[PDB]
């Protein structure tokens with residue numbers, strides 16, 4: 711036998727759908743037909759993409775009908791891109807016994823969306839506030855942000871961490887007011903501090919959590 715033949719794809723252009731993030735996962739498989747002798751290196755396919763955008767793709771070969779098995783190199787992420795036009799050429803392991811036509815496969819990808827958790831913006835060393843505060847007064851009018859611009863999903867603001875009960879939140883407007891009697895003078899307060907953490911949840915359409923710390927400067 712001789713490497714008289716080159717490999718030929720059975721589709722020339724494919725398509726597949728994909729998800730943003732669990733991932734490193736099988737997108738689509740490809741078909742081809744070289745005509746020289748089967749168990750031979752004049753029959754084993756070798757691939758490669760022409761251009762690897764963020765270099766987030768890997769493709770292996772398989773001794774089945776030595777189909778082209780493409781996958782995800784490093785998860786995706788997005789709301790950044792939906793389209794992927796890339797091309798893969800196929801060779802044999804051993805060079806050709808004649809000039810031949812190299813034949814590519816052109817392929818299109820689409821990224822499905824998964825919706826992620828929201829986040830308070832910072833982790834706040836905010837309110838240098840005094841001990842004389844009136845039980846029920848504006849301390850920190852805060853806000854959190856959520857990724858997915860599909861944004862027709864709101865959330866609810868919940869508090870959480872805790873030495874004892876002073877502060878209070880409007881859950882549908884994230885407003886931290888100050889209820890209670892405080893006293894810079896004494897117990898939990900360690901260095902001039904009082905640190906508290908709170909939460910926020912992604913609803914509207916699925917699930918979410920947001921852990922944000924909050925240090926507030928008490929006064930004398």
Ligand SMILES: *[C@@H]1O[C@H](CO)[C@@H](O)[C@H](O)[C@H]1NC(C)=O
Nearest residue numbers: 721723724725726727738818
């Ligand atoms: C698109 O992708 C699907 C994946 O199931 C594939 O069957 C199809 O041949 C590809 N091409 C087009 C035009 O749909």
Ligand SMILES: *[C@@H]1O[C@H](CO)[C@@H](O)[C@H](O)[C@H]1NC(C)=O
Nearest residue numbers: 717718719720742743744745
């Ligand atoms: C490989 O695919 C081409 C495209 O149809 C076809 O003509 C050829 O017969 C296939 N190879 C074999 C051994 O059938």
Ligand SMILES: *[C@@H]1O[C@H](CO)[C@@H](O)[C@H](O)[C@H]1NC(C)=O
Nearest residue numbers: 755756757758769770771772
């Ligand atoms: C498929 O092709 C790639 C690209 O060269 C190669 O690295 C990989 O080893 C091949 N897979 C097999 C099983 O030969």
Ligand SMILES: *[C@@H]1O[C@H](CO)[C@@H](O)[C@H](O)[C@H]1NC(C)=O
Nearest residue numbers: 723724725794795817818819
């Ligand atoms: C694949 O990318 C090409 C290049 O623009 C486009 O024509 C095609 O619609 C994309 N997806 C499918 C289903 O072929």
Ligand SMILES: *[C@@H]1O[C@H](CO)[C@@H](O)[C@H](O)[C@H]1NC(C)=O
Nearest residue numbers: 873898899900903904905906
């Ligand atoms: C304040 O933050 C510190 C540092 O993590 C933590 O140990 C403490 O429990 C928080 N609350 C108070 C009242 O100090």
Ligand SMILES: *[C@@H]1O[C@H](CO)[C@@H](O)[C@H](O)[C@H]1NC(C)=O
Nearest residue numbers: 909911912916917918919920
């Ligand atoms: C949000 O995260 C919290 C972490 O404190 C977790 O316990 C909770 O299950 C999450 N909520 C939802 C709705 O998934």
Ligand SMILES: *[C@@H]1O[C@H](CO)[C@@H](O)[C@H](O)[C@H]1NC(C)=O
Nearest residue numbers: 833907909919920921922923
């Ligand atoms: C946020 O909530 C998650 C869910 O329990 C938790 O794992 C994480 O420690 C929390 N803290 C931050 C800063 O996200």
Ligand SMILES: *[C@H]1O[C@H](CO)[C@@H](O)[C@H](O)[C@H]1NC(C)=O
Nearest residue numbers: 767768769770771781782783
């Ligand atoms: C892609 O995944 C395969 C399977 O683990 C690995 O052997 C290979 O090094 C990775 N990268 C490339 C370019 O094939």
Ligand SMILES: *[C@H]1O[C@H](CO)[C@@H](O)[C@H](O)[C@H]1NC(C)=O
Nearest residue numbers: 799801806809810811812813
């Ligand atoms: C097409 O490119 C391949 C390498 O990817 C090369 O081996 C082949 O000879 C090229 N085609 C021609 C007609 O030279």
Ligand SMILES: *[C@H]1O[C@H](CO)[C@@H](O)[C@H](O)[C@H]1NC(C)=O
Nearest residue numbers: 722723797812813814815816
């Ligand atoms: C695959 O199809 C696309 C669109 O028709 C084209 O740009 C690309 O060059 C094709 N590859 C081959 C080998 O024809």
Ligand SMILES: *[C@H]1O[C@H](CO)[C@@H](O)[C@H](O)[C@H]1NC(C)=O
Nearest residue numbers: 797798799811812813814815
């Ligand atoms: C693969 O085929 C396409 C279209 O036929 C061609 O434009 C491209 O140059 C080829 N790629 C290689 C490496 O030969």
Ligand SMILES: *[C@H]1O[C@H](CO)[C@@H](O)[C@H](O)[C@H]1NC(C)=O
Nearest residue numbers: 832833834907921922923924
């Ligand atoms: C809360 O968020 C702050 C960021 O300001 C971080 O330093 C701290 O470790 C977090 N505490 C917890 C329990 O998540």
Ligand SMILES: *[C@H]1O[C@H](CO)[C@@H](O)[C@H](O)[C@H]1NC(C)=O
Nearest residue numbers: 899900901902903904905925
């Ligand atoms: C209070 O202030 C000092 C100086 O900024 C800081 O380094 C320290 O972490 C804070 N709390 C304690 C218990 O020292």
Ligand SMILES: [Ca+2]
Nearest residue numbers: 715716746752
């Ligand atoms: Ca061949």
Ligand SMILES: [Ca+2]
Nearest residue numbers: 711712714746
């Ligand atoms: Ca032959």
Ligand SMILES: [Ca+2]
Nearest residue numbers: 730787788789
């Ligand atoms: Ca995303």
